[PDB]
Amino acid sequence: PLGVDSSLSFESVGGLDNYINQLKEMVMLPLLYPEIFQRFNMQPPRGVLFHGPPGTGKTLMARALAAACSSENKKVSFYMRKGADCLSKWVGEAERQLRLLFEEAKSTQPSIIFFDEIDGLAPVRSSKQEQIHASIVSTLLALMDGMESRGQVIIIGATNRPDAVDPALRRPGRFDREFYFPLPDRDARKKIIEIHTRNWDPPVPEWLCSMLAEKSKGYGGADLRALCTEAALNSIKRTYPQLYRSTKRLQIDPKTIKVKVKDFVMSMKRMIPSSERSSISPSKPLSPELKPLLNEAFQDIEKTLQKLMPVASKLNPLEEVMYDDPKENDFEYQQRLETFETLRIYKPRFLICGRKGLGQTALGPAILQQYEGVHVQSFDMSTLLQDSTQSIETSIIHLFLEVRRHTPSIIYIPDIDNWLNVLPLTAITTFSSMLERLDFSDQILFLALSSSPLSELHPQLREWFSSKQSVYSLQYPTRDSIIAFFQPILELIKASPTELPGGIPRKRRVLPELPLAPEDRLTPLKQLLIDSTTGFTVDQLLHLHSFLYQIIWNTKSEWNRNSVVDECERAVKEFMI
Amino acid sequence: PLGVDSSLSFESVGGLDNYINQLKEMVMLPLLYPEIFQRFNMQPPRGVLFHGPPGTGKTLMARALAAACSSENKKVSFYMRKGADCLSKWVGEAERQLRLLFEEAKSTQPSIIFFDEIDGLAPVRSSKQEQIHASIVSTLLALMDGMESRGQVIIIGATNRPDAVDPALRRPGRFDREFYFPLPDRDARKKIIEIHTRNWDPPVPEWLCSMLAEKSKGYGGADLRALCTEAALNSIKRTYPQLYRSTKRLQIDPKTIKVKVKDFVMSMKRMIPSSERSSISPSKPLSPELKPLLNEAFQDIEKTLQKLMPVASKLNPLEEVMYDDPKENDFEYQQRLETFETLRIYKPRFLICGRKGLGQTALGPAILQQYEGVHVQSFDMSTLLQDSTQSIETSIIHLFLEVRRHTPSIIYIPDIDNWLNVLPLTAITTFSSMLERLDFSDQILFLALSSSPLSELHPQLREWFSSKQSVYSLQYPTRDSIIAFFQPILELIKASPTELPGGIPRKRRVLPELPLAPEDRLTPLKQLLIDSTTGFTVDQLLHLHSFLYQIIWNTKSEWNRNSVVDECERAVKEFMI
């Protein structure tokens, strides 16, 4: 059956190395080196506040910390407190459980305590309720620190939000660490999936990683293990159909090890993402047959993206201090590199103008997918009108405040032709103010999408975007790209009966026992598809593509060729209306 | 008298086979096959969240699960928890009932627990109330899972809504199953009604099923049994009138078994649907005498419906894996069928333009009835203005979000001539945005009804619906269809006195004892009804139809024919004003 483990070698949360060194410098040093705390007479406190996606290192870095320190040294004890679990309606009974737990935590000397659900442990301190909201918060203040020199004990905090509570709970000088979980995307995703998949006596192929790791976006350690179990059970029922209706119990052979990539892709048909349980995010790669239709400008988007903003990230200070320099006295040499790759910028924004039905609003999610690791959100007016409890301008100042409270991050607005007709001049001039409230010298991108083409626009954008390179206009694709797009189906006309299942028999499987345990017109069709379709829009090409898919689906079984051209050609004739 | 049963062989919820195999793979395997959980070292968790219409498998799949596992293996215990039933205002008393129940649930090893009313068990976790809302939620988190390796115990959840609570209650990795109940419509409706009706020593006829099963729409297992009891008691009082006023008690014969279809149709006169206790849904089949007046285009509606969207549903993977293929390494062969019957589409919509009084707004419910099994709702502005607590555009984004959170589903708007005058340009451009927020490549229908005819319309629809086949215009019916419609009453003129009750005597029934227990002008009338009614509208034909019904009702008793033509003909003369 099932079972939980108490040993973790960072094998389901693995990849947060700089976090690991940051916590090692907090928890290892005070009793590893007990001398330099008097050589300098130094304090440094301990305590980390987790925030980010839950289960992406919430329970997983809980096991990574208890397993980390248990694998670190002997002896050491560990404590798990998950929200309100020692409380009452009394103050003086709730708390007497709490500080009996505190005094026994102080009695056991090598000891850490996990505290999760810090909102449930201590909410915001308001006096418009009963005074236990002030009482347990103040008594946790004095009983964690302030009055209480805790000595050798370590207090761990975890939330989903870094600001779900009043900042008195983060007194600066006791809880000076806060860890954000960035949900690793591609490479530590491939690391975390391959450190999972080696727990099987069949080793997995490594062409499927980072193939499956780039398919899997928005997942924790546990649900990627759920992908492991669902592909596993797909191998189970796949290998054996006789898994049903057993009152007389059965026995098995132990040689039931067969693995498919079909198991994984059926798991992808049968999955659901964790972030996409309640969200809608445009995390959509560009369509692979549409790459003949948009790679040619997509390259210009990613190159001019790279030029108008470097996407350069921070290296590890471990290897940086593994390097050494000779000169260390020169703050002028410091302000040199502090000017380097920092003062090279000015106000990241970009605009897309082009016709409707011409590759719109898919390239947006595509260039969202062409690089990751950055923080990003968009001013979707669905996400702006989603609350009415406050003003929408209060929501504007809020969301501008949180994208201010990040890394160099990404801001997007779709459909600005329809937008600015949606909200009044309150929110308009609000936004135009908030455009200028921040500096040029920070790196926040401002992607902008319009479904209307150029030189016809209200000038609100124009005074905002008077740079000649702050915009790009779109054109029709070339005929060679067109015939590149219709190429594969133009040989799928010829490969019906046994290449495709239009004429492939599907046969039955027998049950196991599992014993008892007690050609020539192709070119006039070519001049029908080309040169009579005078460079139209790509959605119309999607119409035709769907239509011919219906044609070849209905005409899926045919031998003795050149008999199935009449259906598609009259469909083109009808399409020209 | 009455009595409840503890044995169910899926005989009042029967039809959810793929659900049954999905739960069997969760609950049977961990102790059926206790070896492969170490061959792969796999987790898989257990827990299902029910949502959908209550009593359509809520109590019924509760009995199907406890009866399923009790009929599965010996020995096994079962537990029933229905919302708040072990609580208090204390935290620490409410919970001490809860985890005394948890430790005794862990003590009894073969054990499952039913949890219904999950909102009453654990609401959303807000700190703007007393902190027991955070406390019992967090303590149910740690005491179901997270901290607690539950071992062998199974936790069952059930609601009406899949999102009546915050998604922390669905941690991905413990509650990875959620069952929607689809309210089976025709064939599993006939299966579920015939698996009921075989509980009587008279076997029912099978021409009335699926006749009565297609009459009965929107019912659970229990209320269909209430139809069984009401047709039963209609047979009781029908067979015996002496069922009244007995102080001196009486005795019966046991041979009181007579069954009528009259009992069922009087039950239909005396019924009320469960979904139609507070809703108004246009689930209305087309009128059978109006089938001469709309089948001729109705066929075009269902055929072009079928062409513009295939209604093809998913087969069972049981029989699909009962089939086997030779080639299983080819993800390209996978993306073949993943392109098959998926990329054949483009943006399902359809429009109805036609005159007023000409078959409008009944064909809508009719083609709603011509196929079922799909998810469907409509943007009725009654259902849009029904709340004022939020903005109506917030309701727009909400309802678009939930129809996004479904199967390929159906969207309808009636009366678009009167509509777009009802809501301002806020909701208008909101909706036009939400038209384009989703892809072409998903299958969501967009039925549209207008009471005004063609070529006269504001072009908002026209830029939305510039496809030549995205619309259909309506005409007058033909004279042969007209005389087909007036045909049956044109022989009901001749069949008054004993075919119809206009001259049939109704006689009295005696009481049982039940002893003590201590012609020629028809064709000028034909040229009056036809060719002087120059192809008018069908509501006017309903006027006339009602009028002649009043004529023949008042003239219902007549012998020695050809004396009753004067009343209807002068009614036609008066009607021509």
Curated annotation (Swiss-Prot), chains A, B:
It is found in: Nucleus; Chromosome. Homohexamer. Interacts with the FACT complex subunits spt16 and pob3. Interacts with histone H3-H4 (via N-terminus). This is ATPase histone chaperone abo1. The gene is abo1. It comes from the Eukaryota. It comes from Schizosaccharomyces pombe (strain 972 / ATCC 24843). ATPase histone chaperone which facilitates loading of histone H3-H4 onto DNA in an ATP-dependent manner. Plays a genome-wide role in nucleosome organization and establishment of chromatin. Also plays a role in heterochromatin assembly by stabilizing recruitment of the histone methyltransferase clr4 to methylated histone H3, to promote the transition from H3K9me2 to H3K9me3. Disruption phenotype: Abnormal nucleosome distribution. Decreases level of clr4 at the subtelomeric and pericentromeric regions and at DSR (determinant of selective removal) islands containing meiotic genes; decreases di- and tri-methylation of histone H3 'Lys-9' at these regions. Abnormal heterochromatin formation at the pericentromeric outer and inner repeat regions, the subtelomeric region, and the silenced mating-type locus. Impairs centromere function; leads to abnormal mitotic and meiotic chromosome segregation and sensitivity to thiabendazole (spindle poison). The chain holds residues 256 to 1186 of 1190 of the full protein. Belongs to the AAA ATPase family. Changing residue 90 to A: Severely impairs histone deposition activity. The lineage of its organism: Eukaryota, Fungi, Dikarya, Ascomycota, Taphrinomycotina. ATP binds at residues 54-59.
